[PDB]
Design a protein around this ligand. Sequence first.
Ligand SMILES: [Ca+2]
Ligand SMILES: [Ca+2]
Ligand SMILES: [Ca+2]
Ligand SMILES: [Ca+2]
Ligand SMILES: [Ca+2]
Lengths: 339, 339, 339, 339, 339
Amino acid sequence: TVTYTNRVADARLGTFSQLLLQWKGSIYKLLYSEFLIFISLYFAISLVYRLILSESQRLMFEKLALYCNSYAELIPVSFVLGFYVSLVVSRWWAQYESIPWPDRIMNLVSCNVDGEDEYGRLLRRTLMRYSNLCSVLILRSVSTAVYKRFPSMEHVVRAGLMTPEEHKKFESLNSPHNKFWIPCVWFSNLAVKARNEGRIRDSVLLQGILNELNTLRSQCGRLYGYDWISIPLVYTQVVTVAVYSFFLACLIGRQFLDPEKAYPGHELDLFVPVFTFLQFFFYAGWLKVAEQLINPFGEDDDDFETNWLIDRNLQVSLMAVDEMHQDLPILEKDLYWNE
Amino acid sequence: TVTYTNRVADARLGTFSQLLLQWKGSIYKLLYSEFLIFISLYFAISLVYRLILSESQRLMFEKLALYCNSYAELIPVSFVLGFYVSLVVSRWWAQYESIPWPDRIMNLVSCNVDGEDEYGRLLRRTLMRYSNLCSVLILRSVSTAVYKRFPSMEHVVRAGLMTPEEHKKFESLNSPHNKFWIPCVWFSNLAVKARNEGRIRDSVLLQGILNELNTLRSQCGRLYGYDWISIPLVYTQVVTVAVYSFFLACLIGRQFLDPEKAYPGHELDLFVPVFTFLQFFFYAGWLKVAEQLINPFGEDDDDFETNWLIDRNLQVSLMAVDEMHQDLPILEKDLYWNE
Amino acid sequence: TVTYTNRVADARLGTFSQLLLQWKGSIYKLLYSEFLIFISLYFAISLVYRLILSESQRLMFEKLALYCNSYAELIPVSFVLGFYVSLVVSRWWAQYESIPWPDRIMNLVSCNVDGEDEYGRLLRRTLMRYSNLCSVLILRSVSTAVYKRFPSMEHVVRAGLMTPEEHKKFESLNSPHNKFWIPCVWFSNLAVKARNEGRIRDSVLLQGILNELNTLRSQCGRLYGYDWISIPLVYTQVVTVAVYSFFLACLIGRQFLDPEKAYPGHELDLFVPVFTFLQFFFYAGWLKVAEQLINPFGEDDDDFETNWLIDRNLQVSLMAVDEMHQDLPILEKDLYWNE
Amino acid sequence: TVTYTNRVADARLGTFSQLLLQWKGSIYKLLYSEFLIFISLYFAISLVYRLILSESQRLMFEKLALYCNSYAELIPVSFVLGFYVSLVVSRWWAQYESIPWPDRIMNLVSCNVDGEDEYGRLLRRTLMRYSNLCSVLILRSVSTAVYKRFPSMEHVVRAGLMTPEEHKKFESLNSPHNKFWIPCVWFSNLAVKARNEGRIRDSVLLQGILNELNTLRSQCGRLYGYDWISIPLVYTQVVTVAVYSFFLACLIGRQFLDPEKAYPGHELDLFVPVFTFLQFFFYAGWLKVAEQLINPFGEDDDDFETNWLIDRNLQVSLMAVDEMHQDLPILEKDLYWNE
Amino acid sequence: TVTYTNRVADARLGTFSQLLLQWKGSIYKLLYSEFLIFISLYFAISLVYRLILSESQRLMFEKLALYCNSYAELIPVSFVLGFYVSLVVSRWWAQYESIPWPDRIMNLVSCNVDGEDEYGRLLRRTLMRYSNLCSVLILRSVSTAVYKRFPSMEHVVRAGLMTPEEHKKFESLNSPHNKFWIPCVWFSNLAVKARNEGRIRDSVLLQGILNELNTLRSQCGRLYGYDWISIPLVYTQVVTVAVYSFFLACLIGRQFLDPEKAYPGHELDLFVPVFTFLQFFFYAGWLKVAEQLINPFGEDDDDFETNWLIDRNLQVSLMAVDEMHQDLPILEKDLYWNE
Ligand SMILES: [Ca+2]
Ligand SMILES: [Ca+2]
Ligand SMILES: [Ca+2]
Ligand SMILES: [Ca+2]
Ligand SMILES: [Ca+2]
């Protein structure tokens, strides 16, 4: 993602005007190629009109230019872009909040699974590693950056997320579907084993741990559902046909005709339409918003930083249930102590 | 569904322009017949205008064409399509998230119902099969693809979802309503029987299993509610009358009149209106979005893959509570082991 | 409600065009009287213009018709109808999901309240009957169809929902407010009595039953809140003044003036404006959507079927906690049994 | 509030047309003064134009009227009113659902706190009175009607909501912030005291009572948050500058000019513009919707009835935990008793 | 924030018109510099047109002014501002409700952690101080005002939120990420230690305390997610290019041309366009709404008062779990006591 939230905290004079001079993740980086194609086509048509055509051909081209200028209409294009980009942004933020965080399971496994010896330490680390693996196996299915980081399951083993005996048990389980649900079953079986051996005290603490497991499972299921069910293809083809029809009308209708014939609206020849190019930046950039956000797990400048998030979740989890189990600072009186 | 999420991960040059060359689930496959009817009517009217009519008849037709061209208005049609398609897409995604998944019940039944002998194995398998049956009995009511897969209850028996004694008990229960709530009562009675025989340890684990049962029941109730309560019929008839009135105005008002009489706006005869046909693709495709998504359990190219989802849920459930009960990999130290 | 969800499963050629030939719940049944009033007023003004008026009076009427045709403006009317109908449809679907279903309480009372003798049977039936009564007492307050079914509390007694001793206890309780909260207190007291006599085993099962009771109470409170707090009256009067002002402009501005005087836009006399009548069907039907859905508990063709839903809930509840208490089919091996 | 939900149940002929003849809470009562100011300014300008000005002054005024009529533009005003009123109505209904209801705590305190003697009776009444006080102390902060009912804390004591020893303990607690959180701490301490004395049986029932306490605390926190964080002032000033700029353009541009000079669009002198006044009612009433609903706890005709709701909550709570503790009707067989 | 909710309770005559005379947080304070730049550029171009240019240059400037006036189009600018400001306001209110409040943890820690001696007092104070620290460490990451209050962790120590031994333990924990999750692990370990020493009675009360801890952790995670994932930069650059293109068209197209040449629409020379400046206030202020609300934790007049909220939360928490532990008013009969 491109974070600029510290830049737009106050509403000063140059609040949003300073954001037009940025390159990374901007509208220019997304519209360079389309703008150069549009410039090339426009000045090609204009120079063919000025230099090649004969006089009757010029008259027919002027009539065609008036015909095409009658259909350059902005309002329904603005409608369909507004509703489509609203749908895309709603699904974008809805996909962000489905990314699973291990912290709620971390707080309970760090405290409730007892044992300051080796075995309870190993038990807590294995539980949080099973929680992180259940998230990595769905992020490598919904994202291309995580999939380029983990192309095979052996790359998941190399990273330390899965011991080779867990990989042998993982491949021995025979299922033709996506296997992101395997560690979230291993977690619950290990938690019940830990209770039956005497590490978890009562049933209530075990059921709290299992409820947070099911919450993380529902998060992974939401990510799977957003990846598997896209925005419909016809509703994307409608907005592209609309925007490209508007720009095809503006390629011909927005020419500068001959002023000696005095057409209404064509009394001046400027050789370069500034406002047509600004309308191009407006409409084509407001389509590129929806092009960028339709899959936020890719590799754009403003797609989600998911590899960083995997690294954070693994380090924080194994830090909090190993180095922070019953390791508290000394209970002292605070500054607001009355008596 | 038609998945193209891997294709639109990055915002390259040909991001959405490559989606216009696709056929399966596209706008062309949904607009072929309407477009051919529109082409036939338009060129019929145009050739009758050019070849059959006399001169005074030609003058009356030109006056009628100016009258009909005065009413080809795009802005309220774009309004009503925008709001209606927003409603349809909101209900579409709301119906996806109501499809029940057995995984939250699966995690708890795989671990908490004890017994490595035959009886506890049979008990866990019967519990997850009662959870899957409560979902299949509502998917064969809300969907046409699941109903063509399971036309009678005997087809549900053949698939292994229901033993014949369960079918005899199912038909002995006399109720004139939809019976999708029967296995979700059998589940809770079998869970309480399993607790009273000594398989489930405490009351807390039993109540956690029953809470996940009630969550799956609420999912099935949401699917029943979305199928039974449609979008109102008058609010669909409004958008169809609007779009067909616009196209009836464009059949006559968008003719190419005789240029020798020099009507304002009709100075050139091109024999084929490109921009009228592009406006047809835009408006008729933005109506076909709402036609396709108004019942996402049918048999379109972008309706929900529900038979696959039933097969997945059954295989994953019976795999996780039978082959994975207290079958864990060997507890080893991970790569991040400090001491 | 008018269900057509099986008709619009696929996006065929005649998907929505077949819905224009339906009568029950359609736009025609809602716009018959307004359309006949509009036709009568329009042709009255037109025939007075053609037959009664003198020539200077004709000239003044033509000037008035041009003045009124200058104000027939469609875009803000389409704005205010779009936002108002969006609010109405949002509240409509929000009121559907607040209707209470007894099934979550049914699953727990069918299993956890023990006793295969007469007393436990009577206890379970009394609990589910107290759950259904707490829903009927709010549906007869928010709906007119349920109120015509149950005009007095004696009609609730006749239907079997309330024994006469419960009616005596119900009328002995002195409160000047709506008494839909009485059976939801009787439920919790009977559940605690059932626990203290030895029927409910532990505290956890009792608290699960009471939590589902409070969920059904929150559902009834939502229905009470949606009925008591309407859409504001000024926001309905705005959209009616807007639509009726547009149609008052179209009564006079859309006349066919005399072609011999050659007004711009009035060069042809057709005697019947097709597109004005189609704009009438569009705008008046898109107002009738909001007229129909503003109270979905009435007696329209697409209001909620609430009497059927009460009958279903009562039959399913008393069936599941009496005939299905510890009455399970024989535990057999399924078809996917491995060993 | 103005309830008309029983009036608009069916979609008859006079469904919404009968709502235009109502006065209480209507558009007329909110637009009387603005409409009279607009009428006075308009006819003042018109009579100064007709009677006072000389001929060259008349020519300059006609040029100014054409200039101002060129800027009376309706579409962006309709945009900004639509989005702003959508925000106001969304926050309005969101503030209704945050009003706390004591019924979920009432069901649990009526049943779980044991004791048919004096002490348990006093304990249950004190618990529900602490629940109601925690709601009254935030309704007298967010509302002006509740604040006029309870101007000081002594008026809260007079009403019986707070005994004078509770007022002494309430004022002894020294905090410079709003003290609506004090009775919601007293509730939890009294509940734990009641458990430790033997009135509440187990820990599970105590934790259920405390969870419903925290739910009511979150409701009060939502009301505090909606009152403290208003809609931004600049986003209200934008819509008022837009609507008043449109009406300032219509004061001068919508004059009836001299017909003898034959301006295009001013060929008739009617002395009173009907459609300009109807556009005034439309736009000014669609602003008065947002003016009325921006604080729904005031004293408009369609603000929330909060004093009634406080009276209801207090009477229902003290009725249900005192007169209805273990006072059940006699368990009889219902009408659907099979055997 | 700027609170005016007490001012707009009723819908009087001067309800919103009195808000146009306010300065703090208004549209004037946000548009002063842009308005002066626009005034300077406009009157510079106008005086260069009136005094410097020759006659043929005047003719070319009039042609250029007609060309630029043909592109001053308001409707798509109003579209894109409406949808963008709707997104900004939705995220604004969504970020308000993610601010964590300690009151739900406060109610349970004040009652369930036993001990009226020194040790239980210190235990309850340390628990609520760990809850407040977990909120301060994320507010100093998402806000600039809290970060200017707490620039280093030593400033957090000075304020009494963290004792120096807790700071030594906090810096000994080695993690390269944001450490706002450390006190929410210390809380759960101290709660389990308090249960194992005999202060918390059962497992159910401990699990309720831990569930409210996880709820506050999810609140802090939501604030972190809204700060880290901004609105996309291209979707802000689109709306700024649109608004600045409209104002660049209005700088030249809205000039007052020479009336002696009698251009259509330029028949009068007023020297100052009132309606162009009002359209500037409308569009530029409706952009400044989105400029102000895009980061509501900054230092605008209508950003969130977060330092006050931190002070309130700390004082209320340490007041309620120290001075209010088992300190109840005397149980007296209320005014509604029957017998
Ligand atoms: Ca992307
Ligand atoms: Ca379909
Ligand atoms: Ca109705
Ligand atoms: Ca108000
Ligand atoms: Ca700000």
